[PDB]
């Protein structure tokens, strides 16, 4: 089964980590080293980690009972989550350093209600399947993030959306969160695809892997018989090659700036060229 | 494990004075504002006192002037003298710290195990 990424424009294709088109193709700031998104994970061939899910009707959603005090989540088709598999329910939204504000719908019944979602309280737990009310009356509900605000604790702190929120521990490996990503260094840097998101700020949420993408190796299940998967990103309409990229199995992007790969235009196509090795040097952007 | 210890309170008399310490420990990344929380049986939860890692400090109306709050950077501990103390004061105090576990995570909101003040009249 031959490795193949979709053929089909990065500026078409939408976020892993909130339903938004992919605007831009960014890196992180020179303070960001690893990430550890828990949405937007996926492997070369095709093994969702984190709360990945499948497809993006998933992304970013609670669903659970609130009783006026706190929501009991449950797994997006109603079923139940069963703790210490993972850091939260499939599609639990992973943005951290903000505020969440969330639109609550329900079957049968009319109306949408904003759930305003503070990341730090002792009462955020969905690790352990609870989460403030915050005020949203009994009944069962299903959600979906509409726009973030700036954090509500520390008080005065930046939206900081290289971050994932704390999943209600005091212990990091309690919360069974995917591992970090690290740029692998000898100056390849990390690949982000942006969206904007909605909210008072020019907001810019990144992700490792466009959800397209993810479904498309979840379909395929390639073996990964390399190291690396050798990249080029091609404008669809010249077929020139507008830069070297290096794909690692754990899924994510790599390459070399020169100013770099955020000047990319974004309506190009990854193609896979060829198995390298993990020391295969690229040529800068 | 991240752990926040508290030290002090007790019984006084009304009009007297009391000190209280909490000192944070385990294995963290970083650590943003502390403070002092209180809660009498019957009530809620309500800020006392919050100092910033630079010093910055917010006090709860009732406590303004009365109660001083105070921080050691170095050695993440947290300090909370309060004077002139009425018999309204008695409650249950606890520490509050906002600690990042690692680079990648955001902060959250950890707990001591709260300390009785009881203010006779």
């Known amino acids: 089964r031959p490795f193949t990424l979709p053929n089909l424009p990065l500026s078409s294709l939408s976020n892993s980590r909130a339903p938004l088109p992919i605007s831009s193709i960014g890196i992180s700031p020179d303070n960001v080293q690893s990430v550890q998104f828990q949405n937007g994970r996926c492997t070369l061939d095709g093994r969702l980690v984190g709360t990945t899910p499948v497809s993006l009707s998933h992304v970013a959603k609670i669903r659970g009972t609130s009783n006026g005090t706190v929501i009991n989540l449950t797994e997006l088709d109603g079923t139940p989550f069963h703790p210490f598999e993972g850091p939260a329910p499939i599609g639990f939204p992973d943005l951290g350093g903000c505020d969440w504000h969330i639109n609550m719908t329900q079957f049968g019944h009319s109306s949408q209600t904003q759930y305003d979602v503070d990341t730090t309280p002792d009462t955020f737990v969905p690790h352990l399947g609870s989460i403030q009310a915050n005020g949203i009356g009994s009944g069962n509900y299903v959600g979906v993030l509409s726009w973030i605000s700036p954090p509500s604790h520390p008080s005065g702190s930046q939206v900081d959306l290289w971050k994932i929120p704390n999943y209600g521990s005091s212990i990091t490996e309690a919360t069974h969160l995917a591992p970090s990503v690290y740029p692998p260094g000898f100056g390849e840097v990390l690949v982000f695809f942006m969206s904007k998101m909605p909210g008072p700020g020019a907001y810019n949420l990144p992700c490792l892997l466009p959800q397209e993408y993810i479904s498309h190796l979840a379909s395929e299940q390639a073996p990964t018989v390399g190291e690396a998967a050798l990249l080029h990103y091609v404008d669809p309409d010249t077929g020139r090659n507008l830069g070297e990229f290096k794909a690692y199995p754990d899924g994510f992007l790599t390459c070399v700036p020169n100013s770099g790969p955020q000047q990319l235009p974004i309506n190009g196509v990854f193609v896979f060229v060829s198995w390298v090795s993990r020391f295969y040097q690229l040529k800068p952007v | 494990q991240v752990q926040l210890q508290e030290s002090g309170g007790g019984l006084v008399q009304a009009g007297g004075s009391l000190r209280l310490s909490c000192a944070a420990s385990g294995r963290m990344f970083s650590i943003n504002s502390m403070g002092w929380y209180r809660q009498a049986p019957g009530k809620e939860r309500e800020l006392v006192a919050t100092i910033s890692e630079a010093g910055t400090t917010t006090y709860a109306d009732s406590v303004r002037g009365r109660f001083t709050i105070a921080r050691d950077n170095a050695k993440n501990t947290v300090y909370l003298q309060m004077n002139s103390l009425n018999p309204e004061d008695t409650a249950v105090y606890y520490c509050?710290?906002?600690?990042?576990?690692?680079?990648?995570?955001?902060?959250?909101?950890?707990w001591g195990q709260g300390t009785q003040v009881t203010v006779s009249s």
């Open positions: 509050n710290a906002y600690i990042q576990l690692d680079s990648t995570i955001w902060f959250r909101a950890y």
